[PDB]
Design a protein around this ligand. Structure first.
Ligand code: MG
Ligand code: MG
Ligand code: MG
Ligand code: MG
Ligand code: MG
Ligand code: MG
Ligand code: MG
Ligand code: MG
Ligand code: MG
Ligand code: MG
Ligand code: MG
Ligand code: MG
Ligand code: MG
Ligand code: MG
Ligand code: MG
Ligand code: MG
Ligand code: MG
Ligand code: ZN
Lengths: 127, 119, 206, 155, 83, 60, 99, 24
RNA sequence: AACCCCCGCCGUUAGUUGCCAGCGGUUCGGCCGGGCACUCUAACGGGACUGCCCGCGAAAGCGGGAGGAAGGAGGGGACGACGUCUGGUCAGCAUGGCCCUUACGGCCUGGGCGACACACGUGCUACAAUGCCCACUACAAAGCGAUGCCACCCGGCAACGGGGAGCUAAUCGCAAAAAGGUGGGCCCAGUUCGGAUUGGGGUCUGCAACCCGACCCCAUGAAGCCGGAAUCGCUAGUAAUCGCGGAUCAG
RNA sequence: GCAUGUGGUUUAAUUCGAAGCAACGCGAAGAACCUUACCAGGCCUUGACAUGCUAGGGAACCCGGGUGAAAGCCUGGGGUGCCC
């Protein structure tokens, strides 16, 4: 048995697998902490799980590529998010007006010509 | 203790304390603790006298340091002076020697900024 | 000098490249250099034939020079006499398989660069500056085009004060991509100097 | 603005405790986005505070804020020939910034050698009534009053 | 500076006027336009004219002016001041 | 483009260091792409006629 | 068995070209693993719109190398000639592999 | 430092490798 | 304004050189069998309209919400109207005209655009403890490369040199991402801050590094403890901060 | 402090142009000679380049020496195809 979700956020992609059992999380083999060490947004990825009562109800098989661990953790989170409608198409009620089903459509805007870094422009006295 | 003709910073780490000579930097130092095998981590104040001399001879006799080195260097240019060459004419007039631009900038080599009047 | 070239906008949007090949990094540099000889000789001569759009499709060292032109029998001569003179004068420059065709400019007012030329000619021809440009446009919504516009742009009529002129009609909408418009840059030469000319035609939204 | 007032930035409530105030502080520590630092800066100040004056570090924060939150300010302005520094009351949120703003700004002006340390002290010292935190609060209620001479030009 | 894995450098036409007037125990002023070359110990005591832009400059060659290139003894421009 | 100075770069030189490109179409070697044998003025000017295959106008 | 590599400029011909090819390797005696979209490559050119001084106004061009790749499993002698009697796209360059 | 050459990031900045930045 | 591209969701065609959820084997390396699920990979389509609800309103619109990946144009790009400043360049090219044409035209070696009592305009690194430093430890996107990218191997403290496997490039390589993480050293110091300017030693490109190069190692360790009056940028994945890349080009 | 443009000076020349915002890391998305318009020297004169005209010799062409800073110049030899 396995329930899967599609998790994606800002040039980083994450894959989620929800089996019934414990609450151990393997993200690219490694434990949830041996991959998200002294980092605080870490334990936040699990949030979409704990607003329906099930940390200890399911296991976590994980895979990620791209981005940084935040942008992964947002995707991991968005993965456990989607993953729960494939188990309960009724959990959908609880985790949308709670906001956990959405692609953070936010994205590193393009660097523009004439502008040091897109928005930033060049300083000028003697105006 | 004292070496090269200078009393090195007591209370401080060994490795740092030897930089404080005119013959030694970061490297030539921590390699003289390699080649006299005393823990670089410890303080200059906690040695043995045994472990004092042992760095004294090696450091002093091998390299050229202190008074002798600015002396050699303040001669090695004194050399490049009377030579008539490009580089000597610079150490004299106090303009940079390493070819850097000289319109704008180039301060630390000329002194401070002596201001005039445009037109 | 504020705006943009119309053709170079619809690059594979509502137009097409003339030279349509492939190429490697080794080849593209030289290969193209060639086309700009092909199109320098081909032009320089064919002028009083009214030459328009010059395709140069390419396979394995087979060049494929098509040619759209006002007057196919001033490319030809009598019988097939003068087209041969050139068809090799190109394989004389390439060193390979010149397949130099011919394709008539059916309706001549309904293709810009021609329109541009005859006007730039008419300016070289010491004609009535305005009326040139008026009738220019005139004929274009007379042949049946959606939109017309000509831009005479020199020291005009022989004047020392450099100005510019023009007129137009119909839809001229170069901010609609999906509107096909043809640009014509000409470039008259008269005793007082040099007087570039422009011409835009709309045919239709697609 | 000039088209309407902004809605104000709806922050992520704290990951550990849960206060939205805790958030805005952590960001208001943070420099150059280096947020995994300022989170530790915060959560070591709660190890110090829970263990130097053994109560709930979280409660002291709430109080260390109420106590630097000014209530009147000098919303300066002009007539037509010279301009007057002018007493004005303060918004609900405007407090919550200047609170945390100043709490930090003091902590960096504190003399200690350590990061979460100069937060810990300037968190007790705020919720006492001393330290640079509260000094400034009572300083622009003081320039609210020792400048009350033009509370008719107030807007 | 100049690779040691590739030895010193001197121009041929210039070295030619040196070890022919060396091989005849004489000394004359040489006129060449190379500056790009490294003086060698078999030129010491020669009178050598090097060029800067417009002028051949007097450079009699002594000892410890050894491995330095020629152009170090032939200033290229003129700077005395601004007024 | 001083005419003879397209030619001081056409023919092969005394030593291989002196090998500086130039534009086939105008003879400005100041900003030239050794992929078009062309400069920036040209490359547009031409690209604006679609006379360089696959050269699209960019946007993202 | 026999693998093809199409490298062109359009996205149009390069899809067209490779789908004529994909029909006469089915009728002619071959199962086939389909038309393959590949890691396209971009060479871009950022250039000063102006002749002279006006630098910070700039134009943008992208030359898009488009890579296609189709595999023929079970290549017949009813086949191989059917695909040298199919050749017809103009801006494309074809190549033929075999391991 | 960063304009400093004999160091960790100061190499990386220049782009270079030396005794103070290895090749593993 | 829309039609074009990029990014956001999803469906159709597709399974290599990419991918690994289940099963078989496993030199534990998606390594092999097998599969193309999902990630990706490019081509085409779907979808957002004030459509729904209460309210406000003659209407257009507006405010709050339900559903939705996206909500009132979702973010970003290309896109610049009739005209002005006789704005810009005869130094890309084009050309009226005045002007030289055994000379301003042409070839050449060397010298110069880099000079330096100063002044402004732009940026880099700093002045450091939210840090500097040495180890071990993770997570990127984009682009280039068969006249080149150069895995490893050996020599050297090192730049690099020698030998040499792979790659028409999702298959091989530049490639170390860096701030972050673990562990430890520094303890307010002109400092293990800072990294100028110098002395000497070498490597490389190149006919050739004196003018006038970059890089390595050693020694030198300057100004500056966050900056006068004035003044600049940015309204959200922006500002700041950290690394990678490409063009040009032997360097 | 250094990097880069710039003003002013200096220079045999420091080649050019940019001029309030909208000139100033801008023409330079790569100045050691090259680039190179500049200056000092050694030089070339249908010329590094085009389509030719007339008189006289020469197939094109390829190899070497001498002098030289290089260019340049004086000069030895090999060669003698195509059309009628
Ligand atoms: Mg960024
Ligand atoms: Mg700028
Ligand atoms: Mg010209
Ligand atoms: Mg070059
Ligand atoms: Mg340092
Ligand atoms: Mg396979
Ligand atoms: Mg298995
Ligand atoms: Mg528009
Ligand atoms: Mg003006
Ligand atoms: Mg310059
Ligand atoms: Mg080794
Ligand atoms: Mg090597
Ligand atoms: Mg300090
Ligand atoms: Mg805005
Ligand atoms: Mg970079
Ligand atoms: Mg001029
Ligand atoms: Mg020069
Ligand atoms: Zn050009």
């Amino acid at each position: 048995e396995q329930y899967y979700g599609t998790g994606r956020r800002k040039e980083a992609v994450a894959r989620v697998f929800l089996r019934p059992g414990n609450g151990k999380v393997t993200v690219n083999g490694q434990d949830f902490n041996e991959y998200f060490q002294g980092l605080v947004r870490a334990v936040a990825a699990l949030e979409p799980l704990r607003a329906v009562d099930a940390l200890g109800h399911f296991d976590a098989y994980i895979t990620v590529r791209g981005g940084g661990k935040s942008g992964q953790i947002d995707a991991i989170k968005l993965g456990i998010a989607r993953a729960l409608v494939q188990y309960n198409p009724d959990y959908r009620a609880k985790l949308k007006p709670l906001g956990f089903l959405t692609r953070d459509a936010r994205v590193v805007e393009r660097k523009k010509y004439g502008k040091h870094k897109a928005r930033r422009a060049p300083q000028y006295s003697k105006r | 203790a004292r070496i090269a003709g200078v009393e090195i910073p007591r209370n401080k780490r060994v490795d740092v304390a030897l930089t404080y000579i005119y013959g030694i930097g970061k490297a030539r130092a921590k390699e003289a603790l390699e080649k006299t095998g005393i823990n670089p981590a410890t303080r200059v104040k906690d040695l043995t006298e045994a472990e004092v001399v042992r760095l004294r001879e090696y450091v002093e006799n091998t390299w050229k340091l202190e008074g002798e080195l600015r002396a050699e260097v303040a001669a090695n240019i004194k050399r490049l002076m009377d030579i008539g060459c490009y580089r000597g004419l610079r150490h004299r007039r106090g303009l940079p020697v390493r070819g850097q631009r000289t319109r704008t900038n180039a301060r630390t080599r000329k002194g401070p900024r002596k201001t005039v009047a445009g037109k | 000098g504020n705006k943009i070239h119309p053709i170079g906008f619809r690059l594979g949007i509502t137009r097409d490249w003339e030279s349509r090949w492939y190429a490697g990094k080794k080849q593209y540099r030289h290969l193209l250099l060639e086309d700009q000889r092909i199109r320098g000789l081909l032009e320089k001569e064919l002028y009083s034939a009214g030459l328009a759009r010059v395709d140069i499709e390419r396979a394995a060292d087979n060049v494929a020079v098509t040619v759209h032109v006002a007057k196919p029998g001033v490319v030809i001569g009598r019988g097939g006499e003068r087209i041969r003179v050139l068809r090799e004068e190109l394989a004389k420059l390439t060193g390979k398989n010149v397949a130099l065709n011919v394709q008539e400019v059916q309706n001549p007012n309904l293709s810009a660069p021609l329109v541009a030329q005859r006007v730039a000619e008419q300016i070289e021809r010491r004609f009535a500056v305005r009326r040139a440009i008026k009738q220019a446009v005139q004929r274009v919504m007379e042949s049946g085009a959606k939109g017309a516009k000509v831009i005479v742009s020199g020291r005009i009529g022989g004047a020392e004060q450099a100005r510019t002129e023009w007129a137009a009609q119909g839809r001229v909408p170069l901010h609609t991509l999906r509107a096909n418009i043809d640009y014509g840059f000409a470039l008259a030469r008269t005793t007082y100097g040099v007087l570039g000319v422009k011409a835009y035609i709309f045919l239709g939204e697609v | 603005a000039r088209r309407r007032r902004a809605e104000v930035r709806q922050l992520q409530p704290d990951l550990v405790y849960g206060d939205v105030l805790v958030t805005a502080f952590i960001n208001k520590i943070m420099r150059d986005g280096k947020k995994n630092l300022a989170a530790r800066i915060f959560y070591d100040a709660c190890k110090i505070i829970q263990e130097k004056t053994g109560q709930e570090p979280l409660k002291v924060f709430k109080q260390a804020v109420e106590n630097v939150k000014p209530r009147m300010e000098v919303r300066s302005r002009r007539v037509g020939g010279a301009n007057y520094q002018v007493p004005m009351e303060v918004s609900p949120r405007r407090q919550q910034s200047l609170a945390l703003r100043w709490l930090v700004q003091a902590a960096n002006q504190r003399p200690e050698r350590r990061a979460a340390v100069r937060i810990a002290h300037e968190l007790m010292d705020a919720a006492e009534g001393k330290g640079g935190a509260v000094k400034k609060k009572e300083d622009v209620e003081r320039m609210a009053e020792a400048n009350r001479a033009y509370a008719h030009y107030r807007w | 500076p100049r690779s040691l894995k590739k030895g010193v450098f001197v121009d041929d036409h210039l070295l030619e006027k040196v070890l022919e007037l060396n091989a005849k125990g004489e000394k004359r002023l040489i006129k060449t336009w190379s500056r790009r070359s490294t003086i060698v110990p078999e030129m010491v005591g020669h009178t050598i004219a090097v060029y800067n832009g417009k002028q051949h400059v007097p450079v009699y060659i002594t000892e410890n002016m050894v491995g330095h290139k020629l152009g170090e003894f032939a200033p290229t421009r003129t700077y005395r001041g601004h007024g | 483009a001083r005419k003879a100075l397209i030619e001081k770069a056409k023919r092969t030189p005394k030593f291989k260091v002196r090998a500086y490109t130039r534009c086939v179409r105008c003879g400005r070697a100041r900003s030239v792409y050794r992929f078009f044998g062309l400069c920036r003025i040209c490359l547009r000017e031409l690209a604006h006629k679609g006379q360089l295959p696959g050269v699209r106008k960019a946007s993202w | 068995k026999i693998r093809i590599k199409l490298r062109g400029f359009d996205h149009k011909t390069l899809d067209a070209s490779a789908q004529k090819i994909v029909e006469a390797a089915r009728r002619s005696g071959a199962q086939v693993s389909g038309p393959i979209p590949l890691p396209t490559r971009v060479r871009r050119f950022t250039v000063i719109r102006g002749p002279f001084k006006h630098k910070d106004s700039r134009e943008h061009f992208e030359l898009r190398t488009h890579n296609r790749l189709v595999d023929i499993i079970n290549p017949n002698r009813k086949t191989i000639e059917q695909l040298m009697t199919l050749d017809l796209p103009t801006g494309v360059e074809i190549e033929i592999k075999t391991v | 430092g960063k304009g400093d050459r004999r160091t960790r990031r100061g190499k990386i900045w220049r782009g270079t490798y030396g005794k103070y930045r290895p090749r593993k």
